[PDB]
Design a protein around this ligand. Structure first.
Ligand SMILES: Nc1nnc(-c2ccc(C(=O)O)cc2)s1
Length: 329
């Protein structure tokens, strides 16, 4: 008595009908640029997987970002490179400008375009209703494109969305966890940041798809219109799903479990408890009302759903009324 298999309802076989070389990244033969064309300048980020630096291309005085890949299996590096290459030129997709064998760990190093980024903890406090609609629309173009190209980002979150506010410029970065969708494949549920993780990942349902990114996006939309970052703030993976059940309610949650016949950890039993589904208006107050609207609540409602097969796709989302001031302009 195991889980019921699932399939993306859209773009289900895009990779199945593309030449093997498109998704068989392990056979990809990298063509290298010259590492002497770049001068690192300042370190910006240090995470468990990379060292990111603001840098300068000395053949044109253009700023760029260099991500040196700490040693970590040639498969992971090839996956990201192949994906970045497949998506290059996509709408709002960060541009991979060069790839070089970096002597700083003989490791490779990816050279990305620079985005004069206003940091997410300070910007969100200053955005307007129209600004959020606009940027949500831009993020959607990137996801529908990447999904339409058989690729799940799997790490959608505010750090992974660069915004050069003064130029109304948006870029979706860090495709390090991104993967190719092949119908019926069981993936690694340990992706995405805790606060943006979808129900499927939290109950250990592996045959997920593109709709994972839609949940992450819904969590971002919620944080922005209500001005609460992160919106579902759990202590750990178990508590995270509890944070979601307190808002969406346990009823629907158990209806999801039943439909896919997912055996829940017996430790989830006592801590999920029993909660009623709350109204989005309960989170509306005087510091966030000007960013909230029926369209918004309705659009958010259609993103944050337990069943991944019921969430709106990126294309459907762009058709939402929430975006006409935007799509009209
Ligand atoms: N200021 C910045 N401009 N681009 C940045 C950037 C782009 C991509 C990645 C990645 O890991 O893919 C990391 C940082 S950071």
């Amino acid at each position: 008595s195991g889980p019921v298999p699932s399939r993306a309802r859209v773009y289900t076989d895009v990779n199945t009908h593309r030449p093997r070389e498109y998704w068989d990244y392990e056979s990809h033969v990298v063509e290298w640029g010259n590492q002497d064309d770049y001068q690192l300048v300042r370190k910006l980020g240090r995470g468990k997987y990379s060292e990111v630096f603001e840098a300068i291309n000395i053949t044109n005085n253009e700023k760029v970002v260099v991500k040196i890949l700490k040693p970590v299996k040639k498969k992971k590096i090839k996956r990201e490179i192949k994906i970045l290459e497949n998506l290059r030129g996509g709408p709002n997709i960060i541009t991979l400008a060069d790839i070089v064998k970096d002597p700083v760990s003989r490791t490779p190093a990816l050279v990305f375009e620079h985005v004069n980024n206003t940091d997410f903890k300070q910007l969100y406090q200053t955005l307007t209703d129209y600004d959020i609609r606009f940027y949500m629309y831009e993020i959607l173009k990137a996801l529908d494109y990447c999904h339409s190209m058989g690729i799940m980002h799997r790490d959608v979150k505010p750090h992974n969305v660069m915004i050069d506010h003064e130029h109304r410029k948006l870029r979706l970065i860090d495709w390090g966890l991104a993967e190719f969708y092949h119908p019926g494949q069981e993936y690694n549920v340990r992706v995405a940041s805790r606060y943006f993780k979808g129900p499927e990942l939290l109950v250990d349902y592996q045959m997920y798809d593109y709709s994972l990114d839609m949940w992450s996006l819904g969590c971002m939309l919620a944080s922005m219109i209500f001005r609460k970052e992160p919106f579902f703030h759990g202590h750990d993976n178990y508590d995270q799903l509890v944070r979601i059940a307190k808002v969406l309610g346990t009823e629907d949650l158990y209806d999801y479990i039943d439909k896919y016949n997912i055996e829940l950890d017996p430790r989830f039993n006592d801590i999920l408890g029993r909660h009623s589904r709350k109204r989005w208006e309960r989170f509306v107050h005087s510091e966030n009302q000007h960013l909230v609207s029926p369209e918004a609540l309705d659009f958010l409602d259609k993103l944050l759903r337990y069943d991944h097969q019921s969430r709106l796709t990126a294309r459907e989302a762009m058709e939402h009324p929430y975006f006409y001031t935007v799509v009209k302009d």
